[model samples]
Target: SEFKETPELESAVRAMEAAANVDPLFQSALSVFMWLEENGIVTDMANFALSDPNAHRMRNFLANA
Candidate 1:
């Protein structure tokens, strides 16, 4: 598909890059749970974003960008 840029599309492009950085944090958070499993403890991911303040911060920054 041909790529086009509109206000929303441009916002999406920038947000995707923001998402790239956020991906690692998500992985790190998941690893924390994995480590708990290694110790015979398990935690599930449920409404995780609501628990991640950084995600909200990044989302606000993306909106402003």
Candidate 2:
């Protein structure tokens, strides 16, 4: 029983795999976000601005990325 695959991890991995197939750009963005989070940049302005109500300037940023 040395860490085969827990239900939560398995489900999350499956969801990630499906998301990778449907939206590679978002997946890449998520990768960058995760990196930023790991490096303690979660409060960075750019990241915060991404969720701003007026930040609709690039809804397709991922689509074109």
Candidate 3:
């Protein structure tokens, strides 16, 4: 049977929140991150493949993180 683990899920949420503190732009990035997480998508691939204007912002945030 499929079961939802509350503790683990809560821990993941806390980790994401903590990670959000790494930069000032983290609020925007974390919003997108939470969306992707809720949708069951992996973010690293998108980060690696970003281009143009989005890539520019992403790179800026990452550089500061």
Candidate 4:
């Protein structure tokens, strides 16, 4: 009768858990996206790490925090 491990809540939590993994990926990616979008770059994400030789040069253009 009390609230504990209801099927709906369980499924919802599972769905939320699944989303949690990728949501941060989207959030971390989207944050950079808004910057690009506002500046009219409008492209998908790619590795910005220096080791990737094909990485966007714009990645290096940021003025730093």
Top TM-score: which candidate number? 2
For residues 1-65, write the lDDT of model 3, one tens digit per residue: 22256899788767777877886576676687667667766555465666544577667878999
lDDT of 2 by residue, 1-65 (tens): 12246798678756876887899875886687567767776567466577765756445564678
Local distance difference test, per candidate? 0.59, 0.67, 0.66, 0.56
Off by over 4 Å in 2: 1-14, 46-65
The digit string of per-residue lDDT tens for model 1 on 1-65 reads 22344899677656655765768765565556447556654433334555775687657866999
> lDDT (0-100) at residue 25 of candidate 4?
66
Task: Kindly report the root-mean-square deviation of model 2 from the true structure over all alpha carbons.
Answer: 7.5
Q: Is candidate 1 or candidate 4 better by TM-score?
A: 1
Winner on TM-score between 1 and 2 is 2
* Model 4 CA deviation exceeding 4 Å by range: 1-22, 43-65
Give each model a TM-score. 0.32, 0.40, 0.34, 0.31
